[PDB]
Amino acid sequence: AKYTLVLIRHGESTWNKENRFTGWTDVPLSPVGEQEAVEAAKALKEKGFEFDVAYTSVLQRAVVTCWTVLKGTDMCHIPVKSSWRLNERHYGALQGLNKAETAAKHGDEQVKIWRRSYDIPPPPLEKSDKRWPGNDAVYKMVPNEALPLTECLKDTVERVLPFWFDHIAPSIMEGKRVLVAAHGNSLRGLVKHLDKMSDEAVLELNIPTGVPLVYELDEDLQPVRHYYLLDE
Amino acid sequence: AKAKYTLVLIRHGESTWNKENRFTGWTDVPLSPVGEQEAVEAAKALKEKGFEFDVAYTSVLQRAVVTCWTVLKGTDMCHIPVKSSWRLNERHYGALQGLNKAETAAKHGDEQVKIWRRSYDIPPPPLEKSDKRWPGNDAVYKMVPNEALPLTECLKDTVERVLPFWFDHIAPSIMEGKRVLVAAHGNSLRGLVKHLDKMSDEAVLELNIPTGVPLVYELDEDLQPVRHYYLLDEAELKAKMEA
Amino acid sequence: GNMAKAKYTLVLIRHGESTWNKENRFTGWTDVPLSPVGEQEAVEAAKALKEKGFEFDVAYTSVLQRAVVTCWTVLKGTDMCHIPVKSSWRLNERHYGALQGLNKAETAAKHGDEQVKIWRRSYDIPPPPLEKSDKRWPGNDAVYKMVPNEALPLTECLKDTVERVLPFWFDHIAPSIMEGKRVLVAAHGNSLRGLVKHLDKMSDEAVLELNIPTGVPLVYELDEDLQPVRHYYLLDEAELKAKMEA
Amino acid sequence: AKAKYTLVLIRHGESTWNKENRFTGWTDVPLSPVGEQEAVEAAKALKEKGFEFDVAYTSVLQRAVVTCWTVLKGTDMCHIPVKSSWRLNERHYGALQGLNKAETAAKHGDEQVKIWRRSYDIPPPPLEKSDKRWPGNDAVYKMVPNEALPLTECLKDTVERVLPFWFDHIAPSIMEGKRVLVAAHGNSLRGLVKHLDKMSDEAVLELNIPTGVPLVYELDEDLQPVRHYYLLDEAELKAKMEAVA
Ligand code: NA
Ligand code: NA
Ligand code: NA
Ligand code: NA
């Protein structure tokens, strides 16, 4: 009843179509992904939503989603803050591999666990591997110890919260209308916190792609209600 | 001397109002389709010659902001921080903003507009605080004190408004070792160049910065230009300067 | 005066006496410390702010020890040590060029008595400039390593000081006030005269008569548009009249 | 073992409650006169060895903040930016804060407190939101979401609360080439050290950081410790370690 927060998950990426684990792989949006953001922007525009600051991960797919939304809402003048803390969950040694070839290699049960589990991460990369963010110039200014070799949702949540408490939440408290453009697991991290969901309950939480999720929060940042801005 | 640092400046391409032959100033109009493509072309040239960036500075006007995004996209630099500031905005055209050039030329005279357009210290007629074109009435600038928001501006004012941002943000980034990109407008960039090259008040009037062409500055240890150049062959560049 | 209310409250304070104020010597950007009396003026200003219940959310200071320590002392005495403090060379004292470090008598005998009165009280006539080879030039000082040399003065008149202060007002101080933050500004005589000149829309001629006393909180009650509704010092009319005379 | 960066850590000296033999935690108590002087002495040692700083990090508790200012004053480094954060605060002692050791011994028992004091993952009894010692009720933390403010903490929680600040601010400054100073507390510094030296959960329990003594870390290109040392002779240092034992 006091503050309004808008969250959005980027649309389909090239690897979502190629049926391959992405994680921190910095792949671009597919043409369909680019358009989901254009549609979400129009809906926000129609309802008169406006923003004062935007937060994003550092992955192209989220960054472009955010730019598209600002463009479609006439909010290109606002500051945009990116952080690796809003990045998708890192899939370790599975990143870049096709899901079928990994399912046939490791088994259908084991991948379902790695995909939908809360605290069991996929096999870790080695520091010599090029998929390790520690070897990527994009993370040059981030200490290597903070860059994951692999992650379970749990790790993702713990890595996201600090950014919520140190940047996002304070902006809301300062009176700013905030937009957050991120990924499925990163956003599940925020929602888990916002709605105080249990470890078991977030496993069933599915955040649809390219649909604005609006949170009406009270004076103490507790949700009064939430809803998606569409009719599909 | 020799280059120690590299700075890249870029002026946004054509806007809808450039085609509609209308004074823009702080009017937040979008790029035309041709303007969007000039940025794509400038990105490729930067990509080809191996330019990379660590931070990007922009005005708060859509035109420049989108030009910047396009260049980062085309150079695979979408991960970098982007900082916007009203200080990099185009020169404010006062009471002329939104008016067609022919209709103002016929109203006020061909001489008087030429003065207001290419003069250094004579600004166009000022707006009143009641006018909606005054940034002080625009929510975009709600966090900026109204005293800093112009009613009108001459190039001189624009230069004075830009320098502080150069000294407080852009230059320090260069000094910190960061490869900087600046996406702004004609007059705001003339402001930086005037300072960089220590141009006189009279000389900057002849300075014409072509639209959608990266301008690269090789600076020494003390931020003084060793040389500058545009990323385009003499053929394409000659045609861009003439427009 | 105006009977309206304050929307915002801003507190400005000029640091107390420095070692060189006693040595009767031009300081400018020379980073000299406060005298023991200077340290105590800040303790007294803190107590007055404490008694009236003033609280702060952020503090702005120059990068000169003198102002910095004044600010720390005030935060300590008001139980505001938890707030962010932002420093900037833009709030530095006016730079006195080639006069910095010299005694008044020895500069008066060297350059002339009246010429110094002009350099000290004038608005637009600066003192003789330093050379880039001189150590008193901030461009050679590690303290300003991250600030482009072109921005660092060789000398300054009040006018120059005002022009370098304003941007910091518009880019940091004012926005904090607009965000709803109770701001404290600990700086120097000329830098504060710069802010006041702007706040009260004073003329070039009028700011020459403006004397800001040392170690006395100056409170500004500003309206929604940052225009002064009224201002006042936290001191009895007795101690205050004596502070202004100095 | 090739050092590149230098980091200086300092634990504030004695507080009024250290003398009054009482659990402090987030209680914002001031330094004792002896505490103020330890910082003056640490500043002189840093001054003598020529240490200079480019930025300083601190908790938001007066005792640490004043320690930092004193060190900057004594090293002629008052011009540098100082960033404070609740993330560097002392460990929060939950329901034990404000209690005297005798008063806690009489009301919680000698065994339970020894566990709460030297344990890694078992926190002291938690406060209720209706308790005034909960930071959520303190204006100092007005700009920090209440969900982040502890009701109680074990060293483990402290560590988890500190790391993000290390990775988001302190470390990047070191990587940017800045000479950093960190003025904080016993448990918050044990957090950093535990990470820096990759100490095990069991080993940090024996780690004792003396008060008012600069701790210098020589780190390699990848922020890994090459070596560390205190600015004090083995004689004066032996006596400081016994004080903190
Ligand atoms: Na890295
Ligand atoms: Na405004
Ligand atoms: Na410098
Ligand atoms: Na709070």
Per DSSP, the residues of D40-106 read HHHHHHHHHTT---SEEEE-SSHHHHHHHHHHHHHHT-TTS-EEE-GGGSPPP-GGGTT-BHHHHHH
Q: Which of D41, D90, D153, D185 is catalytic?
A: D90
Q: Strand C218-222 vs strand C8-14: parallel, antiparallel, or unpaired?
A: antiparallel
User: If we measure between CA atoms, which residue out of D86, D93, D120 comes closest to residue D108?
Assistant: D93
Q: Looking at the complex, does the CB of residue A174 fall below 8 Å from at least one CB of chain B?
A: no
Q: Which residues of C touch D140 (CB under 8 A)?
A: 82
Count residue pairs from C and D with Cβ separation < 8 A: 36
| Dihedral sign from CA coordinates of B186, B187, B192, B196 | positive
Question: Which residue range is the domain that position C188 belongs to?
Answer: 1-246
Report how far residue C12's alpha carbon sits from residue C97's, in angstroms, rounded to the nearest whole number.
26
Token code pair at residue D52: 């200079």
Report how many domains make up chain B.
1
Active site residue B176: no
Residue A66 near residue A190, CB atoms below 8 Å: no
Determine whether the interchain pair B143/C167 forms a contact, defined as Cβ–Cβ distance below 8 Å: no
**Residue C49 three-state SS:** helix
Beta strands in A38-170 (DSSP E): 53-56, 80-82
User: If we measure between CA atoms, which residue out of A12, A68, A10, A77 comes closest to residue A44?
Assistant: A68
Report how far residue C167's alpha carbon sits from residue C178's, in angstroms, rounded to the nearest whole number.
16
Residue B58 near residue B83, CB atoms below 8 Å: yes
Declared resolution, Å: 2.6
Distance of CA D58 to the CA centre of its chain: 9
Instruction: Kindly give, in sequence order, each residue whose CB lies less than 8 Å from that of residue D105, ignoring residues fewer than 6 positions away.
Output: D113
User: If we measure between CA atoms, which residue out of C54, C51, C13, C20 comes closest to residue C35?
Assistant: C20
Q: What are phi and psi of D217, to 5 degrees?
A: -110, 125
AA identity, residue B149: L
Determine whether the interchain pair C150/B195 forms a contact, defined as Cβ–Cβ distance below 8 Å: yes
Determine whether the interchain pair B78/A71 forms a contact, defined as Cβ–Cβ distance below 8 Å: no
Which of B86, B167, B175 to mutate to test binding with chain C, by most C CBs within 10 Å of its CB?
B167
Active site residue C209: no
Q: Strand B55-58 vs strand D180-184: parallel, antiparallel, or unpaired?
A: unpaired
Q: Which long-range contacts (CB under 8 A, 24 or more apart) does D236-241 make?
A: D237/D210, D237/D213, D240/D210, D240/D211, D240/D212, D240/D213, D241/D208, D241/D210
Q: What are phi and psi of C63, to 5 degrees?
A: -105, 10
Token code pair at residue B194: 């005037």
Tell me the binding residues of B. Answer: 11-18, 24-25, 63, 90-93, 101, 117-118, 186-187
Report how far residue B140's alpha carbon sits from residue B171's, in angstroms, rounded to the nearest whole number.
26
Q: Strand C228-233 vs strand C218-222: parallel, antiparallel, or unpaired?
A: antiparallel
Determine whether the interchain pair B65/A77 forms a contact, defined as Cβ–Cβ distance below 8 Å: yes
Can you give the CATH number for the domain in which D33 is found? Answer: 3.40.50.1240
Please report where in the chains the tokens 């020890």 appear, as a residue: C65
User: If we measure between CA atoms, which residue out of B183, B168, A217, B62 comes closest to residue C171?
Assistant: B168
Please report where in the chains the tokens 């510094």 appear, as a residue: D189
User: If we measure between CA atoms, which residue out of A71, A64, A67 comes closest to residue A27?
Assistant: A64
Q: Looking at the complex, does the CB of residue A107 fall below 8 Å from at least one CB of chain B?
A: no
Q: Which residues of B touch C171 (CB under 8 A)?
A: 164, 168
Residue B80 near residue B52, CB atoms below 8 Å: no
b/e code D104-124 from CB counts within 10 Å (16+ = b): beeebeeeebeebeeeeeebb
Q: Looking at the complex, does the CB of residue A166 fall below 8 Å from at least one CB of chain D?
A: yes
Nearest CA in chain C to D178: C146
Q: How many CB atoms lie within 10 A of CB C76?
A: 18
Q: Which residues of A touch D168 (CB under 8 A)?
A: 162, 166
CA-to-CA separations, B151 to B123, B134, C187, D229, in angstroms, rounded = 10, 6, 31, 61
Determine whether the interchain pair B167/C179 forms a contact, defined as Cβ–Cβ distance below 8 Å: no
Report how far residue C7's alpha carbon sits from residue C178's, in angstroms, rounded to the nearest whole number.
10
Residue D69 near residue D75, CB atoms below 8 Å: no
Count residue pairs from B and C with Cβ separation < 8 A: 39
AA identity, residue C123: Y
